């Protein structure tokens, strides 16, 4: 029944639409959902598929611990949802 | 148990290295996996995951020669 | 912070053989490629091969036959090696992660000049 | 291989001026392969706009890209002296990956 990734109590749906944030995270809302949190999406098969969208905190999700100067920056995201 | 995209009893397991096409079969076919069906998943939730990574049937899959081109793959297993 | 970090020989004496060192740190060989790329003195970029997280390995076929690389996943190095050095070969070495997608280089490492030269 | 023919070779670009440098593939690549670095001498190339249009990290406003298919633009709205460069193109689509012949962006005054 989750139309998405499934981890640790949560279905992730991506969208692939490009989006600025505040676009992403409100794409998100509309949903009841949320932005991925990226200390929740911490395991290498799932951040395979959420690396470079869009993080709750404004951030990409990434593989590393910036590049954060970007003009006009619009990724795709995941809207995440408790099971 | 299917740490990637699970629809409609089979599992589809997302490779990340960039390979050629016949590099990409012969590695599903090590792991008795198959590469994902064009016809399959176009109509689906899928769509958006597999776009531009390599079909069963030697190409991108889609919404030339390609002997060259390199992409990510899933390999798609049935669950029982 | 994403480094890499080419180390090479300096100078090589025609038809001897070459190996450069590419040091990476704040991100793991087993999660980005890296590629090898060369600039003779005043030309262009050329892609010489790369190796994925998983191992996957190509070649640019115009120098296949002559060049290989590796790489240790534990020690965050990758290596090229190259054979039959001609005077041709005199250029800046690269090596450059690739980005998680579409196989854009985000980070180079700063060159290794390398002549060959008796 | 993907050969990318870029022109010109070299231009004389009016300060503050638009102008455009373009790429061209003897193959068809998606939109998505396709990149741009700009090299200053004795600098390593720096990515500069991502899969045809996507602004690099620290990259001003004024750059730009466009393209499809087999033809490829890079446009700076406004030309500035610390333009002044070489510009590759580069295809990631597939093996070998090329990059394309250069053009070193000049400045008049």
């Known amino acids: 029944s989750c139309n998405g990734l499934y981890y640790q109590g949560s279905c992730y749906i991506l969208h692939s639409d490009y989006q600025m944030f505040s676009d992403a995270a409100a794409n998100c809302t509309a949903e009841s959902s949320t932005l991925p949190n990226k200390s929740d999406v911490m395991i290498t098969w799932l951040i395979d598929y959420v690396e470079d969208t869009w993080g709750s905190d404004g951030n990409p999700i990434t593989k590393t611990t910036q590049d954060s100067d970007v003009s006009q920056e619009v990724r795709k995201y995941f809207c995440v949802k408790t099971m | 148990s299917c740490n990637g995209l699970y629809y409609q009893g089979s599992c589809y397991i997302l490779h990340s290295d960039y390979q050629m096409f016949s590099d990409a079969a012969a590695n599903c076919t090590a792991e008795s996996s198959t590469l994902p069906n064009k016809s399959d998943v176009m109509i689906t939730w899928l769509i958006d995951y597999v776009e531009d990574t390599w079909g069963s049937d030697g190409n991108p899959i889609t919404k030339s020669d390609v002997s060259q081109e390199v992409r990510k793959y899933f390999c798609v297993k049935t669950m029982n | 912070q994403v480094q890499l970090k080419e180390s090479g020989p300096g100078l090589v004496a025609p038809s001897q053989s070459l190996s450069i060192t590419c040091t990476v740190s704040g991100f793991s060989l087993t999660d980005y490629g890296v590629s090898w790329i060369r600039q003779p003195p005043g030309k262009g970029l050329e892609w010489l091969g790369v190796t994925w997280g998983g191992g996957t390995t190509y070649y640019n076929s115009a120098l296949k036959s002559r060049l290989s690389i590796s790489k240790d996943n534990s020690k965050s190095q990758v290596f090229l090696k190259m054979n039959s050095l001609q005077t041709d070969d005199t250029a800046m070495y690269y090596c450059?992660?690739?980005?998680?997608?579409?196989?854009?280089?985000?980070?180079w490492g700063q060159g290794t000049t390398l002549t060959v030269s008796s | 291989e993907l050969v990318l023919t870029q022109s010109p070779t070299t231009m004389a670009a009016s300060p503050g001026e638009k102008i455009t440098i373009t790429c061209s593939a003897s193959?068809?690549?998606?939109?998505?392969?396709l990149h741009w670095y700009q090299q200053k001498p004795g600098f390593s190339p720096k990515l500069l706009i991502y899969r045809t249009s996507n602004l690099a990290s620290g990259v001003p406003a004024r750059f730009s890209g466009s393209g499809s298919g087999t033809s490829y633009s890079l446009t700076i709205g406004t030309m500035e002296a610390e333009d002044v460069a070489t510009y590759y193109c580069?295809?990631?689509?597939?093996?070998?990956?090329?990059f394309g012949s250069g053009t070193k962006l000049e400045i008049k005054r």
């Open positions: 450059a992660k690739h980005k998680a997608s579409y196989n854009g280089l985000d980070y």
């Open positions: 193959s068809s690549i998606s939109s998505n392969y």
């Open positions: 580069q295809q990631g689509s597939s093996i070998p990956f090329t």
